[PDB]
Amino acid sequence: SHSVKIYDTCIGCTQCVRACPTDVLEMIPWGGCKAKQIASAPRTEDCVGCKRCESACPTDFLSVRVYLWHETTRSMGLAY
Amino acid sequence: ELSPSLVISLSTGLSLFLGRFVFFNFQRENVAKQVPEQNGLTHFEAGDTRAKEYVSLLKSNDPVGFNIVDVLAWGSIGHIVAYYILATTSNGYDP
Amino acid sequence: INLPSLFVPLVGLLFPAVAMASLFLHVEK
Amino acid sequence: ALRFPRFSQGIAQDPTTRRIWFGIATAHDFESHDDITEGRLYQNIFASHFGQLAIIFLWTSGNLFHVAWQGNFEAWVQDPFHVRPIAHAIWDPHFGQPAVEAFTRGGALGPVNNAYSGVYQWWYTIGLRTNEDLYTGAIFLLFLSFISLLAGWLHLQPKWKPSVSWFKNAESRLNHHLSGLFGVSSLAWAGHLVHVAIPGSRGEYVRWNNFLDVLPHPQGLGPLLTGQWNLYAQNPSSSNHLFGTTQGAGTAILTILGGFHPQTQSLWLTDMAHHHLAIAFLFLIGGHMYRTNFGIGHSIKYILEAHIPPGGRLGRGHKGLYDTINNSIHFQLGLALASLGVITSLVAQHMYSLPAYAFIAQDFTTQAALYTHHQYIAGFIMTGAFAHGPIFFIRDYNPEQNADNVLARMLEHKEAIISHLSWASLFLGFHTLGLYVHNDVMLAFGTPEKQILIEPIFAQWIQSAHGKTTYGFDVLLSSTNGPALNAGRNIWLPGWLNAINENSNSLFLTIGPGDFLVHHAIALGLHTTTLILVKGALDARGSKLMPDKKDFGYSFPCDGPGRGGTCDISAWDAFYLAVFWMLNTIGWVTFYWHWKHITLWRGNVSQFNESSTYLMGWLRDYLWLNSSQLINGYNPFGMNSLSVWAWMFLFGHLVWATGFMFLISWRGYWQELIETLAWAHERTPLANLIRWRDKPVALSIVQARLVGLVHFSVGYIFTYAAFLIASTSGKFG
Amino acid sequence: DISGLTPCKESKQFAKREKQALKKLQASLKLYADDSAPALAIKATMEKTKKRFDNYGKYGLLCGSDGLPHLIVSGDQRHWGEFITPGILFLYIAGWIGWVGRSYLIAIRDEKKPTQKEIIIDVPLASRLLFRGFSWPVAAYRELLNGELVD
Amino acid sequence: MRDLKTYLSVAPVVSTLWFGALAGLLIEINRFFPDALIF
Amino acid sequence: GPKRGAKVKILRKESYWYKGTGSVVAVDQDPNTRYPVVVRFNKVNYANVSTNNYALDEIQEVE
Amino acid sequence: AHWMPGEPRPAYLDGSAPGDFGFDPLGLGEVPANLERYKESELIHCRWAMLAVPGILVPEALGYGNWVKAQEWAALPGGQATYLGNPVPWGTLPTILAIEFLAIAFVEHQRSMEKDPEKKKYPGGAFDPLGYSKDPKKLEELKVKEIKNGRLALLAFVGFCVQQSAYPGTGPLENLATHLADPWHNNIGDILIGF
Numbered sequence A: 001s002h003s004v005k006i007y008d009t010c011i012g013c014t015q016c017v018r019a020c021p022t023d024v025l026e027m028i029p030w031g032g033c034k035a036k037q038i039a040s041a042p043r044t045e046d047c048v049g050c051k052r053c054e055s056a057c058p059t060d061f062l063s064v065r066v067y068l069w070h071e072t073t074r075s076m077g078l079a080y
Numbered sequence B: 001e002l003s004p005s006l007v008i009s010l011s012t013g014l015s016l017f018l019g020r021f022v023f024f025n026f027q028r029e030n031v032a033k034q035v036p037e038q039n040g041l042t043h044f045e046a047g048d049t050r051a052k053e054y055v056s057l058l059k060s061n062d063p064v065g066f067n068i069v070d071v072l073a074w075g076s077i078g079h080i081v082a083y084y085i086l087a088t089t090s091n092g093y094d095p
Numbered sequence C: 001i002n003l004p005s006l007f008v009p010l011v012g013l014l015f016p017a018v019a020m021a022s023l024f025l026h027v028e029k
Numbered sequence D: 001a002l003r004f005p006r007f008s009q010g011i012a013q014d015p016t017t018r019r020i021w022f023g024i025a026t027a028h029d030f031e032s033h034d035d036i037t038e039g040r041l042y043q044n045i046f047a048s049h050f051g052q053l054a055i056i057f058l059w060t061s062g063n064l065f066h067v068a069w070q071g072n073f074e075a076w077v078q079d080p081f082h083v084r085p086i087a088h089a090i091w092d093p094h095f096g097q098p099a100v101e102a103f104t105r106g107g108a109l110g111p112v113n114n115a116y117s118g119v120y121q122w123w124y125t126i127g128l129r130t131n132e133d134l135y136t137g138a139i140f141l142l143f144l145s146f147i148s149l150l151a152g153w154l155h156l157q158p159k160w161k162p163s164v165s166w167f168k169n170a171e172s173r174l175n176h177h178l179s180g181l182f183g184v185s186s187l188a189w190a191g192h193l194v195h196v197a198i199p200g201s202r203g204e205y206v207r208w209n210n211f212l213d214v215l216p217h218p219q220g221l222g223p224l225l226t227g228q229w230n231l232y233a234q235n236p237s238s239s240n241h242l243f244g245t246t247q248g249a250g251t252a253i254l255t256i257l258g259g260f261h262p263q264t265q266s267l268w269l270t271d272m273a274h275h276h277l278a279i280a281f282l283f284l285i286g287g288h289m290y291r292t293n294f295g296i297g298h299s300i301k302y303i304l305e306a307h308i309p310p311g312g313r314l315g316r317g318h319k320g321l322y323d324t325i326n327n328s329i330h331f332q333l334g335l336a337l338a339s340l341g342v343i344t345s346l347v348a349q350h351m352y353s354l355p356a357y358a359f360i361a362q363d364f365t366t367q368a369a370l371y372t373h374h375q376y377i378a379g380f381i382m383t384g385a386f387a388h389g390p391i392f393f394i395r396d397y398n399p400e401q402n403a404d405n406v407l408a409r410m411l412e413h414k415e416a417i418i419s420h421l422s423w424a425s426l427f428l429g430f431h432t433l434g435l436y437v438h439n440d441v442m443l444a445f446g447t448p449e450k451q452i453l454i455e456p457i458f459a460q461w462i463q464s465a466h467g468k469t470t471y472g473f474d475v476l477l478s479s480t481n482g483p484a485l486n487a488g489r490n491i492w493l494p495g496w497l498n499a500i501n502e503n504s505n506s507l508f509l510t511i512g513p514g515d516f517l518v519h520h521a522i523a524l525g526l527h528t529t530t531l532i533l534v535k536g537a538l539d540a541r542g543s544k545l546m547p548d549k550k551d552f553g554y555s556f557p558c559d560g561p562g563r564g565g566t567c568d569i570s571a572w573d574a575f576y577l578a579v580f581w582m583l584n585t586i587g588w589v590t591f592y593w594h595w596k597h598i599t600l601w602r603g604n605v606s607q608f609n610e611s612s613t614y615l616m617g618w619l620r621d622y623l624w625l626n627s628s629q630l631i632n633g634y635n636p637f638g639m640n641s642l643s644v645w646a647w648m649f650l651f652g653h654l655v656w657a658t659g660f661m662f663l664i665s666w667r668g669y670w671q672e673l674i675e676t677l678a679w680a681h682e683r684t685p686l687a688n689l690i691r692w693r694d695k696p697v698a699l700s701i702v703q704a705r706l707v708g709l710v711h712f713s714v715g716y717i718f719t720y721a722a723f724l725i726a727s728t729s730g731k732f733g
Numbered sequence E: 001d002i003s004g005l006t007p008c009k010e011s012k013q014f015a016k017r018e019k020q021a022l023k024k025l026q027a028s029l030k031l032y033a034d035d036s037a038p039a040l041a042i043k044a045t046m047e048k049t050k051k052r053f054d055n056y057g058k059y060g061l062l063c064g065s066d067g068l069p070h071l072i073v074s075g076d077q078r079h080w081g082e083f084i085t086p087g088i089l090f091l092y093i094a095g096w097i098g099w100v101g102r103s104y105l106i107a108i109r110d111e112k113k114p115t116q117k118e119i120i121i122d123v124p125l126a127s128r129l130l131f132r133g134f135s136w137p138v139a140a141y142r143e144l145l146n147g148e149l150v151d
Numbered sequence F: 001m002r003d004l005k006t007y008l009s010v011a012p013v014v015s016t017l018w019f020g021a022l023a024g025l026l027i028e029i030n031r032f033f034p035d036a037l038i039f
Numbered sequence G: 001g002p003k004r005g006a007k008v009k010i011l012r013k014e015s016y017w018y019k020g021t022g023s024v025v026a027v028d029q030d031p032n033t034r035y036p037v038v039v040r041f042n043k044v045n046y047a048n049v050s051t052n053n054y055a056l057d058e059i060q061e062v063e
Numbered sequence H: 001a002h003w004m005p006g007e008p009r010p011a012y013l014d015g016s017a018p019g020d021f022g023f024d025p026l027g028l029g030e031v032p033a034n035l036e037r038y039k040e041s042e043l044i045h046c047r048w049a050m051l052a053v054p055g056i057l058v059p060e061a062l063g064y065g066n067w068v069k070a071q072e073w074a075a076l077p078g079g080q081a082t083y084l085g086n087p088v089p090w091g092t093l094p095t096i097l098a099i100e101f102l103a104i105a106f107v108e109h110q111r112s113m114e115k116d117p118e119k120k121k122y123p124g125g126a127f128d129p130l131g132y133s134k135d136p137k138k139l140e141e142l143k144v145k146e147i148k149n150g151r152l153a154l155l156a157f158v159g160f161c162v163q164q165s166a167y168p169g170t171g172p173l174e175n176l177a178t179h180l181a182d183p184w185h186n187n188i189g190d191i192l193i194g195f
């Protein structure tokens, strides 16, 4: 599977979560930012690595990062 | 014509004399300032078993510590200078 | 010309067949 | 890993075809394999080097064996001017009768290929005379091959496995390589020239069974130890000496004559012997510099650590470089490849102008082949040097341990370096293209007198200082009253000045405006290629567009369409882009060399001198002309021995364009197409019974770039090789 | 002469080129009525041609074995017009352009919307900064010594 | 009218007029001082 | 920390405006906020963003 | 007292050193250790020049020789040298080369072993039999005199070498006489703005 990481520069705008086409990310409670929330990646086995999340992130630099790793039938987006 | 034996022996003598008396302290000092090592520890501490400094061979009962190695070194310089002089004086070069 | 008629088809046809079959089985295992 | 590749379970768990490809493509990148350590790394590299050596020895033995078995080496040594050297016989059952008839060249009794590697001139020059010699040498090199394989296997075994510490013993390896590998080898080769080559050229058959019974010098070994070395240079070969014969032969074994042996038009064997001897001495003396196990010698770490200029304009100087080099094999490979590339180009440049092989340089196709060969090899080697450069910067470089040294400071002002390379390339491009296009327009409008033709005053001045009298600058070696001229007037200057002013050879060819222009094209090529490579190296760790690039490695597809788009952002991609510019640059240099030399050998340098000033001239008078015979290798009327090169010419064009396919069209299109094909297969009866074990997918982005570049390069090389050989050998100058 | 070249006024091939050129032009001229426009055109080409060769000869140009003017850029004082002088002129004009552009970019740097005046040129401002380039060496030299050139 | 002037001051129009003027200049200069290879 | 409207230099290495200057908009007083210093910049980044949050050790008040 | 009136002298040059006139445009003595070494080496160059200059002029006037023609006896198979007109027996290139090498190497390396920075430039002791350095103030004054005469000697040496480059084969005194011939016609002009 691919690897997805969240860093504490996250401001919890939730943009990345609603950008993922395979339901990989989600928002969890946190106290480090005003929005009282931070991103999380509990389902990277379904991650394809399209990087829409990274394109949705406002922070500089990114608070969500996708490191393409071991390649599986799910990550290759195969339907056969 | 120059005697090869006289030139070589005199040259080697001058070199060995220079190494034994006039340049000995300086050489020993600079050597004291330098020793090969990788990541802090030496090559033998790392350690390569074939990189240990020979303690036995370097031993000498000479007053200052002039050993076989220094003899080979300054001797080498001596022979080099000698054969340089010989070969040079042998040619018929004219500028 | 004698040996080439033996070695050329050997290296050009037999060898790559053996090698490709072997590598195929190896990679598929 | 439970399946191929065994060195990576990450790839092994791939259900697709990718698994195979990447398996093949990462097989030699030991650092990224599973459960690897520094030890396994160095040991595998060592064994791999032994393997490479074995392959080299086997290759050479193959060449020797085939020349001896199927060639005309003896017929060649009897008449080197009028015999085409046979590389090997050919047995192709696809041949028709005209093909069989056409390819029967030389004194062969069947189809053959003519060698353009120039092994004949080499082997003949060094002392080989018969097929038997070649066979024995082949057997010996085969023996060396077996020995090398045995050594790899041996040093892989637990008893003979060297430790990492041993590999990191730099001082010892430097001492031994400088004194032994460089020194002793060169001394021993001088030994071969004195004992075998020189007597062989004088008509004396000296082999193993008698070399102890023959004196290499009339009063041998005496003068060496006596210091009367001059006696070894007493009477050199005469100016009317015939190679391989006693006629005109002298007795000297070590000289500095300079120039060429008039018959063979190559360097004197005594000159080469004296050369190898001398450099052997410099190496041997220089090989006693570093400290080992004897209490004397230098410490490289201390030397580096001491070279920091007070005032701090270079920061901490070279402090810490010893470790960061000795720990990073990639840094070492970068330095190695850089130096090797430089000296490979040096080999080309010196071998075309100062040939050392008897009756080469008369062989025009061989010379062209050699130059092009070594210049392309040099190019690739250079790009590789600059490729292992940034791999170091990513995988190995430790910022903290390199604090404020020359390397860290190098990364500091990277923008300055890159921007100035950019300026240089930009300037050279604008003005060289501009001047060319100007001249072309002038030729078009029928006014070539309005051309801007800048004379290469500087290079011509250098030539004059070297003793060429065509431009009449009268400087240094061209000035009769110059102390530099008087200094060696009675040594090498006779032969040398005789050679540099003999305008039928390639020793400092005469140059005009065309040479100026194309030289600035070459400058453009070098500067631009280094722009790509250097920029790729310095931004390998990160940039403002991707500050954490180092966390992704040397090679990755991209970083995504976000932030404006990040295609070709990896250092690997920088390399990949740089390869095109290297191919272009070497293209220009080989074009230059080949055209100038073809016009030289044809007897009309005015052709080059007038036509090279405008690009229509290169296109029409170089490319279009010299393909006449090539494209006529086969036609509706018949075929000849050039059909191979025509077929290979087209082959190259085709492969090149396929390269264009992989380079222009990208992945998604093909992936979806393949999806429709997968559906197609699962819904086709009878064929349904057959199913794949590895899911079919489109090649990866990076994989696509690599395969595309490979087709491109292969097409490039093969096309130009076919043109070179066909155009040159079709007329032989 | 320099680089083994021969002066164009003394070059035979130079003259032969002029000859063949003029003769080609005349060979084309033979087909047209002398008073017609094509005739006047071709004749204008002939006069321009010979004036060109004559001027090149007069300028002290050196010709190769090709019969074409080659240029000497080593700094040789007999050929400063062959690179040095037009080079100085170029540098002057280019410096002018660059300095004016720099002035314009600096002038609008401190504004509400700077990019605006980069896509829609402030012609009054541009005309004010236009002639300042005439003294660009003096202006830049002083800014160099002052520290207003770089940051 | 002010808007039209603003349009005339836009980058492509400014460039067309500027390079048009330059083209005219260089053309006339090369007509009066033709075949210049020196100076 | 620095005042509102204060000109600060960026010390975060991976920032688009690294080694450059921006203006302080507001500082979060919540001590749990890891990056309180809100900064706005004259030029947008590659993501068309003109504002970013930084920590106290990532800004340097200069003039 | 500085070398350029009105020009501020460097921070590390207070004028407490003999010959300290605040001349260092390139700021080479900005590093103290380097500056000390430069003092030593300047004195060495000075003393060598002060020995060289009269050794160039004297044998040209008296010995009717030339400091450049006195070099030419070597570089040829003959290799015979003369001193005060008298041909020296051991005066051959290799011999005097070996002697010079050994002697100068010994004395220079012996100078190299000194650690005290003040004695590395002002050794004294055996090198001061007249004890002219016993009085501190007189030592300082004589130091200033030494560095000044030395620098002037260096400048003279530069003069000799450049004048030799311009007029090869002719000595400095010969050039002085040539200048005395037509001072308004025989000058550096013929070399600078000539011809």
Ligand code: CLA
Pocket (backbone or CB within 6 Å): C008, C009, C011, C012, C013, C014, C015, C017, D093, D094
């Ligand atoms: C490089 C090695 C190599 C060699 C030695 C050959 C040899 C041959 N090929 Mg070629 N071929 C090759 C590679 C090679 N090919 C490649 C890479 C391609 C694709 C570019 C081709 C495409 C090709 C085509 C389209 C044709 C050939 C043909 C031929 C035959 C020449 C025509 C003829 O008159 O023979 C006389 C041939 C016969 C009298 C019949 C041959 C019967 C064979 C020998 C029986 C072998 C049986 C045995 C089980 C084979 C198993 C081998 C396997 C286990 C390794 C000859 C045997 C022609 C051919 O095959 O004719 C039938 C032909 O039409 N080849």
Ligand code: CLA
Pocket (backbone or CB within 6 Å): D024, D025, D026, D027, D028, D029, D030, D333, D337, D380, D381, D382, D383, D384, D385, D387, D388, D391, D554, D555, D572, D575, D710, D714
């Ligand atoms: C001293 C020689 C040398 C050595 C020991 C290495 C070693 C290495 N290189 Mg380096 N490099 C070198 C020179 C060298 N290189 C040169 C000359 C270049 C310029 C081309 C490069 C450019 C380069 C790049 C861009 C990369 C490396 C990488 C590597 C590492 C992995 C190699 C691998 O597994 O490939 C696997 C082997 C293959 C994929 C097969 C290679 C065959 C190629 C594709 C051409 C084949 C076409 C064929 C000839 C066509 C047939 C023609 C016929 C049909 C007519 C390994 C450490 C890689 C790395 O790991 O970096 C971190 C990497 O990405 N190298």
Ligand code: CLA
Pocket (backbone or CB within 6 Å): D422, D425, D426, D427, D428, D429, D430, D433, D524, D528, D531, D532, D577, D578, D580, D581
């Ligand atoms: C023949 C095709 C071609 C040409 C002309 C170029 C030209 C250039 N490439 Mg290269 N490139 C090419 C193919 C080509 N490339 C290929 C196949 C690849 C592999 C992908 C690359 C990959 C590559 C890389 C990685 C890099 C370059 C760079 C460059 C620039 C190098 C600096 C220079 O010489 O400036 C001189 C300028 C030119 C030669 C361009 C011509 C400008 C014209 C003559 C001026 C305008 C004329 C006229 C007024 C226009 C009227 C048009 C009208 C519609 C208005 C130069 C613009 C480098 C770069 O950008 O450095 C700054 C760089 O890093 N290229």
Ligand code: CLA
Pocket (backbone or CB within 6 Å): D654, D657, D658, D659, D660, D661, D662, D664, D665
């Ligand atoms: C000149 C180089 C070249 C070649 C050979 C191809 C070939 C192909 N392209 Mg194209 N392509 C190219 C340039 C090229 N392209 C470029 C520059 C671009 C960028 C615009 C593209 C973009 C592109 C697109 C968008 C598409 C293609 C498609 C295709 C395939 C069409 C189907 C077909 O005709 O198969 C037949 C194969 C050939 C005609 C190639 C030659 C076959 C040889 C002669 C057979 C040799 C025999 C044997 C295999 C030899 C083996 C020897 C070995 C074992 C030693 C075909 C493989 C299409 C596709 O995939 O449709 C199915 C498609 O949609 N390509």
Ligand SMILES: CC1=C(/C=C/C(C)=C/C=C/C(C)=C/C=C/C=C(C)/C=C/C=C(C)/C=C/C2=C(C)CCCC2(C)C)C(C)(C)CCC1
Pocket (backbone or CB within 6 Å): B012, B016, B071, B072, B073, B074, B075, B076, B077, B079, B080, B081, B083, D281
């Ligand atoms: C005991 C004693 C003594 C004595 C001592 C002595 C005397 C010693 C000697 C020693 C010696 C006597 C040594 C020697 C050595 C030598 C050497 C070490 C050599 C080397 C060589 C070389 C290195 C060579 C090289 C070469 C070659 C081989 C070739 C040719 C050229 C050349 C030269 C390069 C005394 C009394 C003092 C005191 C105490 C006791």
Ligand SMILES: CC1=C(/C=C/C(C)=C/C=C/C(C)=C/C=C/C=C(C)/C=C/C=C(C)/C=C/C2=C(C)CCCC2(C)C)C(C)(C)CCC1
Pocket (backbone or CB within 6 Å): D330, D331, D332, D333, D334, D335, D338, D342, D385, D386, D388, D389, D390, D392, D393, D537
């Ligand atoms: C990226 C990287 C890298 C790499 C780099 C490179 C690859 C580079 C290249 C480089 C190069 C490629 C260089 C070159 C150089 C060259 C030179 C430096 C030369 C010199 C020469 C000379 C010095 C000569 C002289 C002379 C003459 C001219 C004539 C006469 C003789 C004589 C000798 C005098 C490394 C790994 C490091 C690390 C970091 C990263």
Ligand SMILES: CC1=C(C/C=C(\C)CCC[C@H](C)CCC[C@H](C)CCCC(C)C)C(=O)c2ccccc2C1=O
Pocket (backbone or CB within 6 Å): D661, D662, D663, D665, D666, D667, D668, D670, D671, D697, D698, D699, D700, D701, D704
């Ligand atoms: C044509 C094309 C394909 C389709 C190509 C495919 C699927 C490869 C099919 C190759 C067949 C299976 C074998 C071809 C024959 C080769 C010569 C086999 C060589 C094997 C080596 C080990 C020798 C892509 O997948 C692709 C992906 C990304 C960018 C561009 C492209 C692209 O251009």
